[PDB]
From Swiss-Prot:
Modified residues (Cysteine persulfide): C215
GO molecular function: cadherin binding; enzyme binding; ephrin receptor binding; insulin receptor binding; non-membrane spanning protein tyrosine phosphatase activity; protein kinase binding; protein phosphatase 2A binding; protein tyrosine phosphatase activity
Residues modified to S-nitrosocysteine: C215
Top-level EC class: hydrolase
GO terms under biological process: actin cytoskeleton organization; cellular response to angiotensin; cellular response to fibroblast growth factor stimulus; cellular response to hypoxia; cellular response to nerve growth factor stimulus; cellular response to nitric oxide; cellular response to platelet-derived growth factor stimulus; cellular response to unfolded protein
Chief location: endoplasmic reticulum
Result for mutant: S50 to A/D: No phosphorylation
Taxon lineage: Eukaryota, Metazoa, Chordata, Craniata, Vertebrata
Tissue expression profile of the protein: Expressed in keratinocytes (at protein level).
Protein name (Swiss-Prot/TrEMBL): Tyrosine-protein phosphatase non-receptor type 1
Compartment(s): Endoplasmic reticulum membrane
Amino acid sequence: MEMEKEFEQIDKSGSWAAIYQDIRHEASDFPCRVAKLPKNKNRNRYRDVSPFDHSRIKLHQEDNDYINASLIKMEEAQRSYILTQGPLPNTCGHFWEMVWEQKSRGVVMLNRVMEKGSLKCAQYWPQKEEKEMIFEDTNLKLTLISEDIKSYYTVRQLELENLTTQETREILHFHYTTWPDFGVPESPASFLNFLFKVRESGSLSPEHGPVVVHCSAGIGRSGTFCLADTCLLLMDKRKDPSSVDIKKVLLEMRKFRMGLIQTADQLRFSYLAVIEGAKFIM
Ligand SMILES: CCc1oc2cc(S(=O)(=O)Nc3ccc(S(=O)(=O)Nc4nccs4)cc3)ccc2c1C(=O)c1cc(Br)c(O)c(Br)c1
């Protein structure tokens, strides 16, 4: 397997840091003028993680359509993703407005609410069936329908209601709870399992709006998810599976959102995930 041989070559020469820096250098650079506007200061979690203006998701509300979220459109793989930041206390309503407006089926969460003893995002979904959430600013209701807690992840059924029209939708919350506080998983097994469980639900399928993916910043673990998914999809489609270049696919993705894959460790893991995912397929 061509990319596995490249993987092993980088490992032997210990050049993960150098390969990653090269990608960082070649990465696209686009304006984030809307994100930087003073009125949107409280709508961003990190100063250095902003959506490009050209691929940003726009809220269908007049006056301030801003949400820190980007549409990643992969033409060849025929797959779209919305990467966003973990909702802030003040952007929970915005978050679900987007989900509603973009006709999303699935929400993918790759972080725990608290990690390393700090809050990484707001508790933006109901933890108990009988305690529903109403978001007064965007006029939406959210109800926990069911919860399935597994070893490495948790799946939730949620009902999102548009209070204006009384229209309701079922939303699937896929929450990966076992990403380590430091570094990356030792084995891609559980991550790949999770990815394909997301796939199974139809949440990544063309008959629905784009999946909404987030970690804390919505670039690191988020990037790994999308990147692996796209690479594996490409290997299935192409006449020559060995032609799938993960660096090229990642550079392609970076045209839509900055900072996908934060460390050389994450890049290495992405490779691993694609390689191991391929060998399973087989
Ligand atoms: C690409 C999907 C996938 O890739 C994986 C890789 C691992 S792994 O990291 O342990 N690596 C691994 C493990 C086993 C093999 S193997 O080829 O020797 N065994 C099998 N291959 C196919 C069926 S049984 C090759 C590589 C574990 C589990 C998975 C797995 C799944 O979790 C998964 C796969 C499918 Br297809 C699916 O529908 C669902 Br749901 C989950």
